[PDB]
mmCIF file of N, CA and C and ligand atoms in Angstrom:
data_model
loop_
_atom_site.group_PDB
_atom_site.id
_atom_site.type_symbol
_atom_site.label_atom_id
_atom_site.label_comp_id
_atom_site.label_asym_id
_atom_site.label_seq_id
_atom_site.Cartn_x
_atom_site.Cartn_y
_atom_site.Cartn_z
ATOM 1 N N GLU A 11 39.563 -36.517 15.672
ATOM 2 C CA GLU A 11 37.922 -37.571 14.896
ATOM 3 C C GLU A 11 37.729 -37.135 13.728
ATOM 4 N N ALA A 12 38.981 -36.928 12.801
ATOM 5 C CA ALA A 12 38.661 -36.358 11.261
ATOM 6 C C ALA A 12 39.668 -37.343 11.137
ATOM 7 N N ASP A 13 39.345 -38.886 11.127
ATOM 8 C CA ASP A 13 40.034 -39.643 9.460
ATOM 9 C C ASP A 13 40.387 -38.959 8.473
ATOM 10 N N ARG A 14 41.587 -39.226 8.090
ATOM 11 C CA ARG A 14 42.841 -38.606 7.146
ATOM 12 C C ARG A 14 43.601 -39.009 6.443
ATOM 13 N N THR A 15 43.236 -40.222 6.736
ATOM 14 C CA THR A 15 43.928 -42.613 6.143
ATOM 15 C C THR A 15 43.161 -42.440 4.939
ATOM 16 N N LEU A 16 44.308 -42.661 4.308
ATOM 17 C CA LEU A 16 43.883 -43.670 2.867
ATOM 18 C C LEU A 16 44.250 -44.455 2.772
ATOM 19 N N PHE A 17 43.637 -46.530 2.666
ATOM 20 C CA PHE A 17 44.371 -47.615 1.508
ATOM 21 C C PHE A 17 44.332 -47.384 0.825
ATOM 22 N N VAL A 18 45.630 -47.584 0.805
ATOM 23 C CA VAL A 18 46.181 -47.507 -1.263
ATOM 24 C C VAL A 18 46.097 -49.398 -1.168
ATOM 25 N N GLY A 19 46.241 -50.789 -2.162
ATOM 26 C CA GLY A 19 46.399 -51.376 -2.586
ATOM 27 C C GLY A 19 46.859 -52.036 -3.503
ATOM 28 N N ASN A 20 47.363 -53.081 -3.682
ATOM 29 C CA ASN A 20 47.415 -53.802 -5.320
ATOM 30 C C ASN A 20 48.559 -53.139 -6.174
ATOM 31 N N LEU A 21 49.308 -52.750 -4.746
ATOM 32 C CA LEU A 21 50.700 -51.566 -5.263
ATOM 33 C C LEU A 21 51.622 -52.571 -5.778
ATOM 34 N N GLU A 22 52.313 -52.830 -7.062
ATOM 35 C CA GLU A 22 53.365 -53.289 -7.880
ATOM 36 C C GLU A 22 54.932 -53.265 -6.831
ATOM 37 N N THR A 23 55.747 -53.848 -6.366
ATOM 38 C CA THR A 23 56.518 -54.143 -5.841
ATOM 39 C C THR A 23 57.586 -52.857 -6.017
ATOM 40 N N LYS A 24 57.853 -52.444 -7.529
ATOM 41 C CA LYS A 24 58.923 -51.600 -7.138
ATOM 42 C C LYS A 24 58.313 -50.257 -7.014
ATOM 43 N N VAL A 25 56.338 -49.411 -6.383
ATOM 44 C CA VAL A 25 55.966 -48.835 -6.173
ATOM 45 C C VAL A 25 57.189 -48.382 -4.306
ATOM 46 N N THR A 26 57.402 -47.022 -4.381
ATOM 47 C CA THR A 26 57.771 -46.800 -2.961
ATOM 48 C C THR A 26 57.306 -45.852 -1.869
ATOM 49 N N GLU A 27 57.524 -45.250 -0.340
ATOM 50 C CA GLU A 27 57.127 -44.399 -0.533
ATOM 51 C C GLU A 27 57.206 -42.919 -0.531
ATOM 52 N N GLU A 28 58.129 -42.740 -0.855
ATOM 53 C CA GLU A 28 58.399 -41.660 -1.636
ATOM 54 C C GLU A 28 57.489 -41.660 -2.715
ATOM 55 N N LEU A 29 57.532 -42.806 -4.226
ATOM 56 C CA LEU A 29 56.112 -42.769 -5.181
ATOM 57 C C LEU A 29 55.215 -42.162 -5.409
ATOM 58 N N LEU A 30 53.882 -42.632 -3.632
ATOM 59 C CA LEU A 30 52.999 -42.963 -3.598
ATOM 60 C C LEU A 30 52.761 -41.043 -2.446
ATOM 61 N N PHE A 31 53.651 -40.744 -2.332
ATOM 62 C CA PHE A 31 53.776 -39.205 -1.788
ATOM 63 C C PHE A 31 53.755 -37.857 -2.753
ATOM 64 N N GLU A 32 54.707 -38.697 -3.887
ATOM 65 C CA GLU A 32 54.592 -37.482 -4.774
ATOM 66 C C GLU A 32 53.358 -38.001 -5.733
ATOM 67 N N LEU A 33 53.040 -39.001 -5.447
ATOM 68 C CA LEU A 33 51.512 -38.978 -6.628
ATOM 69 C C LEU A 33 49.872 -38.451 -5.938
ATOM 70 N N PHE A 34 50.171 -38.987 -4.706
ATOM 71 C CA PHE A 34 48.960 -38.191 -3.795
ATOM 72 C C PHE A 34 49.051 -36.744 -3.527
ATOM 73 N N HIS A 35 50.538 -36.233 -3.403
ATOM 74 C CA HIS A 35 50.514 -35.184 -3.409
ATOM 75 C C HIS A 35 49.672 -33.931 -4.760
ATOM 76 N N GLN A 36 49.452 -34.683 -5.628
ATOM 77 C CA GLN A 36 48.914 -34.178 -6.470
ATOM 78 C C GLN A 36 47.253 -33.821 -6.008
ATOM 79 N N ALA A 37 46.558 -35.166 -5.164
ATOM 80 C CA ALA A 37 45.523 -34.822 -5.558
ATOM 81 C C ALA A 37 45.053 -33.674 -3.768
ATOM 82 N N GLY A 38 46.054 -33.693 -3.014
ATOM 83 C CA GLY A 38 46.374 -32.803 -2.048
ATOM 84 C C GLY A 38 47.320 -32.793 -1.149
ATOM 85 N N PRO A 39 48.096 -31.550 -0.250
ATOM 86 C CA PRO A 39 49.212 -31.749 0.948
ATOM 87 C C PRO A 39 49.334 -32.992 1.411
ATOM 88 N N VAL A 40 49.985 -34.374 1.399
ATOM 89 C CA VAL A 40 50.447 -35.252 1.844
ATOM 90 C C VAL A 40 51.377 -35.070 3.181
ATOM 91 N N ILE A 41 51.367 -35.573 3.871
ATOM 92 C CA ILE A 41 51.568 -35.578 5.813
ATOM 93 C C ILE A 41 52.795 -37.089 5.398
ATOM 94 N N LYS A 42 52.523 -38.041 5.237
ATOM 95 C CA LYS A 42 52.688 -39.212 5.433
ATOM 96 C C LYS A 42 52.614 -40.182 4.376
ATOM 97 N N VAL A 43 53.594 -41.808 3.188
ATOM 98 C CA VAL A 43 53.262 -42.372 2.826
ATOM 99 C C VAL A 43 54.197 -43.455 3.916
ATOM 100 N N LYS A 44 53.173 -44.231 4.916
ATOM 101 C CA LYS A 44 53.855 -45.522 4.920
ATOM 102 C C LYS A 44 53.467 -46.931 4.639
ATOM 103 N N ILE A 45 54.688 -47.378 3.922
ATOM 104 C CA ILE A 45 54.440 -48.876 3.642
ATOM 105 C C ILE A 45 54.679 -49.600 4.809
ATOM 106 N N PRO A 46 53.685 -51.282 5.146
ATOM 107 C CA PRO A 46 54.386 -51.143 6.393
ATOM 108 C C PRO A 46 55.134 -52.767 6.095
ATOM 109 N N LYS A 47 55.462 -53.308 6.813
ATOM 110 C CA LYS A 47 56.631 -55.009 6.936
ATOM 111 C C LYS A 47 55.806 -55.536 7.468
ATOM 112 N N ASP A 48 56.636 -57.191 6.751
ATOM 113 C CA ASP A 48 56.152 -58.028 6.630
ATOM 114 C C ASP A 48 56.388 -58.626 8.705
ATOM 115 N N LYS A 49 56.542 -60.539 8.463
ATOM 116 C CA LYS A 49 57.402 -60.929 10.283
ATOM 117 C C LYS A 49 58.696 -61.170 9.112
ATOM 118 N N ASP A 50 58.839 -60.559 8.130
ATOM 119 C CA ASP A 50 60.243 -61.253 8.375
ATOM 120 C C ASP A 50 60.905 -59.655 7.310
ATOM 121 N N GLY A 51 60.132 -58.416 7.827
ATOM 122 C CA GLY A 51 60.580 -56.993 7.029
ATOM 123 C C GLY A 51 59.895 -56.918 5.271
ATOM 124 N N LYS A 52 60.045 -57.524 4.650
ATOM 125 C CA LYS A 52 59.040 -57.356 3.980
ATOM 126 C C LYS A 52 58.124 -56.092 3.213
ATOM 127 N N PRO A 53 57.996 -55.297 2.594
ATOM 128 C CA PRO A 53 57.224 -54.733 2.162
ATOM 129 C C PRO A 53 56.192 -55.101 1.749
ATOM 130 N N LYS A 54 55.066 -55.050 2.653
ATOM 131 C CA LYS A 54 53.351 -55.256 1.613
ATOM 132 C C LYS A 54 52.773 -54.750 0.730
ATOM 133 N N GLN A 55 51.566 -55.315 0.320
ATOM 134 C CA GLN A 55 51.793 -54.568 -1.407
ATOM 135 C C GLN A 55 50.733 -53.937 -1.084
ATOM 136 N N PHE A 56 50.177 -53.276 0.232
ATOM 137 C CA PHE A 56 49.138 -52.086 0.550
ATOM 138 C C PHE A 56 49.994 -50.626 0.883
ATOM 139 N N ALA A 57 49.358 -49.310 1.307
ATOM 140 C CA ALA A 57 50.099 -48.031 2.159
ATOM 141 C C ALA A 57 48.916 -47.413 1.934
ATOM 142 N N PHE A 58 49.822 -46.702 3.768
ATOM 143 C CA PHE A 58 49.481 -45.992 4.224
ATOM 144 C C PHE A 58 48.966 -44.232 3.778
ATOM 145 N N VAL A 59 48.111 -43.643 3.617
ATOM 146 C CA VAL A 59 47.941 -42.483 3.410
ATOM 147 C C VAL A 59 47.294 -41.503 3.670
ATOM 148 N N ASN A 60 48.655 -40.841 4.088
ATOM 149 C CA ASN A 60 47.511 -39.507 5.622
ATOM 150 C C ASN A 60 47.558 -38.229 5.257
ATOM 151 N N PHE A 61 46.459 -37.164 4.979
ATOM 152 C CA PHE A 61 45.943 -36.022 4.571
ATOM 153 C C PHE A 61 46.192 -35.072 6.143
ATOM 154 N N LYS A 62 46.768 -34.189 4.635
ATOM 155 C CA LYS A 62 46.381 -33.174 6.267
ATOM 156 C C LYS A 62 45.220 -32.888 6.440
ATOM 157 N N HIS A 63 44.282 -32.721 5.607
ATOM 158 C CA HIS A 63 42.773 -32.607 5.235
ATOM 159 C C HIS A 63 42.300 -33.689 4.863
ATOM 160 N N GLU A 64 41.311 -34.525 5.796
ATOM 161 C CA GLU A 64 40.439 -34.881 5.671
ATOM 162 C C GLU A 64 39.755 -35.211 3.782
ATOM 163 N N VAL A 65 39.646 -34.135 3.642
ATOM 164 C CA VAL A 65 38.764 -33.136 2.502
ATOM 165 C C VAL A 65 39.777 -33.926 0.861
ATOM 166 N N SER A 66 40.489 -34.241 1.154
ATOM 167 C CA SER A 66 41.658 -35.095 0.677
ATOM 168 C C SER A 66 41.632 -36.028 -0.438
ATOM 169 N N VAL A 67 40.881 -36.204 0.885
ATOM 170 C CA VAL A 67 40.737 -37.856 0.912
ATOM 171 C C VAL A 67 39.583 -38.338 -0.804
ATOM 172 N N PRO A 68 38.688 -38.340 0.204
ATOM 173 C CA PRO A 68 37.013 -38.593 -0.805
ATOM 174 C C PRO A 68 37.522 -37.855 -2.620
ATOM 175 N N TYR A 69 38.934 -37.483 -2.675
ATOM 176 C CA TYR A 69 39.412 -36.529 -3.763
ATOM 177 C C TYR A 69 39.746 -37.357 -4.463
ATOM 178 N N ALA A 70 41.260 -38.064 -3.734
ATOM 179 C CA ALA A 70 42.095 -38.389 -4.040
ATOM 180 C C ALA A 70 41.078 -39.523 -4.785
ATOM 181 N N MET A 71 40.107 -39.761 -4.171
ATOM 182 C CA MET A 71 39.360 -41.667 -4.372
ATOM 183 C C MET A 71 39.223 -41.775 -5.655
ATOM 184 N N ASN A 72 38.382 -40.212 -6.252
ATOM 185 C CA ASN A 72 37.725 -39.573 -7.272
ATOM 186 C C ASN A 72 39.361 -39.683 -8.919
ATOM 187 N N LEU A 73 40.695 -38.966 -8.599
ATOM 188 C CA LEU A 73 41.202 -38.428 -9.380
ATOM 189 C C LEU A 73 42.339 -39.859 -9.211
ATOM 190 N N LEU A 74 41.996 -40.329 -7.999
ATOM 191 C CA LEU A 74 43.679 -41.612 -8.553
ATOM 192 C C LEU A 74 43.323 -42.992 -8.414
ATOM 193 N N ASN A 75 42.366 -42.914 -8.604
ATOM 194 C CA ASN A 75 42.178 -44.460 -8.074
ATOM 195 C C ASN A 75 41.984 -45.362 -9.596
ATOM 196 N N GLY A 76 42.159 -46.620 -9.530
ATOM 197 C CA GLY A 76 42.821 -47.565 -10.916
ATOM 198 C C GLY A 76 43.722 -47.498 -11.388
ATOM 199 N N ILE A 77 44.287 -46.224 -11.279
ATOM 200 C CA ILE A 77 45.712 -45.052 -12.079
ATOM 201 C C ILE A 77 46.596 -46.068 -12.275
ATOM 202 N N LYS A 78 47.086 -46.613 -13.072
ATOM 203 C CA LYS A 78 48.258 -48.080 -13.339
ATOM 204 C C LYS A 78 49.526 -47.354 -12.753
ATOM 205 N N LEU A 79 50.710 -48.154 -11.847
ATOM 206 C CA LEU A 79 51.685 -47.850 -11.491
ATOM 207 C C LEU A 79 52.467 -49.013 -12.061
ATOM 208 N N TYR A 80 53.311 -49.240 -12.761
ATOM 209 C CA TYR A 80 54.305 -49.670 -13.400
ATOM 210 C C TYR A 80 53.310 -50.876 -13.640
ATOM 211 N N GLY A 81 51.995 -50.502 -14.749
ATOM 212 C CA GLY A 81 51.889 -52.104 -14.954
ATOM 213 C C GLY A 81 50.571 -52.128 -14.476
ATOM 214 N N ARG A 82 50.267 -51.680 -13.093
ATOM 215 C CA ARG A 82 48.902 -52.677 -11.695
ATOM 216 C C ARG A 82 48.543 -50.587 -11.491
ATOM 217 N N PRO A 83 47.533 -51.388 -11.545
ATOM 218 C CA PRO A 83 45.922 -50.492 -11.281
ATOM 219 C C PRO A 83 45.790 -50.475 -10.036
ATOM 220 N N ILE A 84 46.147 -49.186 -9.088
ATOM 221 C CA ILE A 84 46.225 -49.093 -7.605
ATOM 222 C C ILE A 84 44.920 -49.102 -6.905
ATOM 223 N N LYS A 85 44.663 -50.115 -5.738
ATOM 224 C CA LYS A 85 43.279 -49.934 -5.147
ATOM 225 C C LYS A 85 42.954 -49.264 -4.198
ATOM 226 N N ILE A 86 42.773 -48.394 -4.328
ATOM 227 C CA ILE A 86 41.785 -47.718 -2.647
ATOM 228 C C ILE A 86 40.530 -47.745 -2.495
ATOM 229 N N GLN A 87 40.721 -48.627 -1.624
ATOM 230 C CA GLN A 87 39.528 -49.207 -1.299
ATOM 231 C C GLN A 87 38.906 -47.823 -0.237
ATOM 232 N N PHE A 88 40.056 -47.691 0.669
ATOM 233 C CA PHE A 88 39.847 -46.765 1.343
ATOM 234 C C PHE A 88 38.580 -44.489 0.949
ATOM 235 N N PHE B 7 51.856 -25.469 -5.028
ATOM 236 C CA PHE B 7 51.439 -26.772 -5.509
ATOM 237 C C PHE B 7 50.877 -26.687 -7.602
ATOM 238 N N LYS B 8 51.600 -26.878 -8.569
ATOM 239 C CA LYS B 8 51.628 -27.348 -9.829
ATOM 240 C C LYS B 8 50.892 -28.243 -9.873
ATOM 241 N N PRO B 9 49.854 -28.357 -10.586
ATOM 242 C CA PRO B 9 49.159 -29.651 -10.885
ATOM 243 C C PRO B 9 50.097 -29.964 -11.950
ATOM 244 N N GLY B 10 49.744 -31.093 -12.156
ATOM 245 C CA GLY B 10 49.983 -32.369 -13.566
ATOM 246 C C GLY B 10 51.899 -30.886 -14.122
ATOM 247 N N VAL B 11 52.674 -31.372 -12.571
ATOM 248 C CA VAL B 11 54.202 -31.040 -13.169
ATOM 249 C C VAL B 11 55.047 -32.439 -11.880
ATOM 250 N N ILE B 12 55.348 -33.603 -13.008
ATOM 251 C CA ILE B 12 55.739 -34.936 -12.160
ATOM 252 C C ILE B 12 57.097 -34.818 -12.591
ATOM 253 N N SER B 13 58.000 -35.887 -11.187
ATOM 254 C CA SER B 13 58.580 -35.435 -11.514
ATOM 255 C C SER B 13 59.335 -36.714 -12.837
ATOM 256 N N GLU B 14 60.335 -37.301 -12.269
ATOM 257 C CA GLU B 14 61.361 -38.159 -13.864
ATOM 258 C C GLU B 14 60.300 -38.991 -12.982
ATOM 259 N N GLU B 15 60.894 -39.826 -12.282
ATOM 260 C CA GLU B 15 60.689 -40.911 -11.269
ATOM 261 C C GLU B 15 59.242 -41.514 -11.657
ATOM 262 N N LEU B 16 58.585 -40.127 -11.370
ATOM 263 C CA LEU B 16 56.322 -40.754 -11.532
ATOM 264 C C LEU B 16 56.604 -41.084 -13.122
ATOM 265 N N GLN B 17 56.869 -40.759 -13.631
ATOM 266 C CA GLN B 17 56.541 -40.201 -15.577
ATOM 267 C C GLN B 17 56.811 -41.881 -15.531
ATOM 268 N N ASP B 18 57.693 -42.259 -15.211
ATOM 269 C CA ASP B 18 57.879 -43.341 -15.623
ATOM 270 C C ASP B 18 57.281 -44.382 -14.880
ATOM 271 N N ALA B 19 56.793 -43.657 -14.013
ATOM 272 C CA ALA B 19 55.894 -44.736 -13.244
ATOM 273 C C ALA B 19 54.598 -45.355 -13.656
ATOM 274 N N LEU B 20 54.260 -43.993 -14.501
ATOM 275 C CA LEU B 20 53.135 -43.538 -14.922
ATOM 276 C C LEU B 20 53.298 -43.784 -16.620
ATOM 277 N N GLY B 21 53.908 -44.118 -16.652
ATOM 278 C CA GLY B 21 54.312 -44.758 -18.617
ATOM 279 C C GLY B 21 54.112 -43.577 -19.436
ATOM 280 N N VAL B 22 54.118 -42.251 -18.586
ATOM 281 C CA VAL B 22 54.585 -41.310 -19.477
ATOM 282 C C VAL B 22 55.487 -41.642 -20.517
ATOM 283 N N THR B 23 55.059 -40.981 -21.983
ATOM 284 C CA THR B 23 56.263 -41.024 -22.747
ATOM 285 C C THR B 23 56.514 -39.793 -23.298
ATOM 286 N N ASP B 24 55.217 -38.222 -23.321
ATOM 287 C CA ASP B 24 55.941 -37.207 -23.550
ATOM 288 C C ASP B 24 55.608 -35.910 -22.074
ATOM 289 N N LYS B 25 57.320 -35.479 -21.926
ATOM 290 C CA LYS B 25 56.554 -35.004 -20.198
ATOM 291 C C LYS B 25 56.130 -33.661 -20.815
ATOM 292 N N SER B 26 56.099 -32.865 -22.282
ATOM 293 C CA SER B 26 54.985 -32.002 -22.307
ATOM 294 C C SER B 26 53.161 -32.186 -21.640
ATOM 295 N N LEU B 27 52.372 -32.751 -22.203
ATOM 296 C CA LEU B 27 51.794 -33.432 -21.886
ATOM 297 C C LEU B 27 51.009 -33.352 -19.721
ATOM 298 N N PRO B 28 50.662 -33.546 -19.402
ATOM 299 C CA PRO B 28 49.901 -32.723 -18.297
ATOM 300 C C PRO B 28 49.367 -33.827 -17.983
ATOM 301 N N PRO B 29 49.617 -34.292 -17.229
ATOM 302 C CA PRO B 29 48.374 -35.374 -16.178
ATOM 303 C C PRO B 29 48.027 -34.880 -14.841
ATOM 304 N N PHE B 30 46.700 -35.419 -14.786
ATOM 305 C CA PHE B 30 46.219 -35.365 -14.231
ATOM 306 C C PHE B 30 45.056 -33.778 -14.120
ATOM 307 N N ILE B 31 46.345 -33.022 -15.639
ATOM 308 C CA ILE B 31 45.036 -32.443 -15.299
ATOM 309 C C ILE B 31 43.483 -32.151 -16.188
ATOM 310 N N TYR B 32 43.267 -32.825 -16.980
ATOM 311 C CA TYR B 32 41.892 -33.000 -17.960
ATOM 312 C C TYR B 32 40.471 -33.601 -16.705
ATOM 313 N N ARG B 33 41.226 -34.221 -15.393
ATOM 314 C CA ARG B 33 40.202 -34.365 -14.927
ATOM 315 C C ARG B 33 40.193 -33.843 -13.719
ATOM 316 N N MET B 34 41.269 -32.318 -13.188
ATOM 317 C CA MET B 34 41.179 -31.417 -12.336
ATOM 318 C C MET B 34 39.643 -30.824 -12.684
ATOM 319 N N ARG B 35 40.086 -30.097 -13.683
ATOM 320 C CA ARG B 35 38.991 -29.457 -14.811
ATOM 321 C C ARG B 35 37.982 -29.665 -14.618
ATOM 322 N N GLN B 36 36.882 -31.066 -14.954
ATOM 323 C CA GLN B 36 36.322 -31.378 -14.186
ATOM 324 C C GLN B 36 35.841 -31.444 -12.680
ATOM 325 N N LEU B 37 36.421 -31.856 -12.134
ATOM 326 C CA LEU B 37 36.489 -32.704 -10.457
ATOM 327 C C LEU B 37 36.188 -30.915 -9.902
ATOM 328 N N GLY B 38 37.224 -30.488 -10.184
ATOM 329 C CA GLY B 38 37.241 -29.123 -9.612
ATOM 330 C C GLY B 38 38.727 -28.653 -8.862
ATOM 331 N N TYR B 39 39.225 -28.205 -8.921
ATOM 332 C CA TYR B 39 39.958 -27.838 -7.537
ATOM 333 C C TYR B 39 40.512 -28.123 -6.583
ATOM 334 N N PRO B 40 41.427 -28.742 -6.156
ATOM 335 C CA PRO B 40 40.915 -29.889 -5.285
ATOM 336 C C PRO B 40 40.694 -29.377 -3.757
ATOM 337 N N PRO B 41 40.580 -29.621 -3.221
ATOM 338 C CA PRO B 41 39.908 -28.272 -1.850
ATOM 339 C C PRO B 41 40.839 -28.674 -0.185
ATOM 340 N N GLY B 42 41.640 -30.025 -0.487
ATOM 341 C CA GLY B 42 42.792 -29.452 0.450
ATOM 342 C C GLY B 42 43.911 -29.078 -0.144
ATOM 343 N N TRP B 43 44.245 -28.481 -1.115
ATOM 344 C CA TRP B 43 45.223 -27.049 -1.483
ATOM 345 C C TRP B 43 44.276 -25.846 -1.178
ATOM 346 N N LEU B 44 42.849 -25.565 -1.046
ATOM 347 C CA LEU B 44 42.391 -24.120 -0.750
ATOM 348 C C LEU B 44 43.140 -24.191 0.445
ATOM 349 N N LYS B 45 43.863 -24.822 1.514
ATOM 350 C CA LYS B 45 43.826 -24.842 2.811
ATOM 351 C C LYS B 45 45.123 -24.569 3.211
HETATM 352 BR BR1 BR C 101 43.947 -38.492 -14.630
#
């Protein structure tokens, strides 16, 4: 009943799941980061960050929104 | 949990020139200790 998932968009193409893991690990313990695939297996330009605890979600919003990764500011809409 | 300690891959992604400058610690001091690390 607790939603511990963040949606993060506008990722630059070089951003990886391990990269986001380490980055959002600063805001709180991260369980997994998934970057979904396209119809041809292409990685999408957004990712799902799943935290261990719900409280990590609002904190990560303030700490990490707009941070530039490879010149592209991430957009945390969740 | 060591705040502002990051790998070289992340430093290049963040564009950090100087590795001794801790990133994210300045604002954590304002926001407070990340609640998800307390538990
Ligand atoms: Br910062």
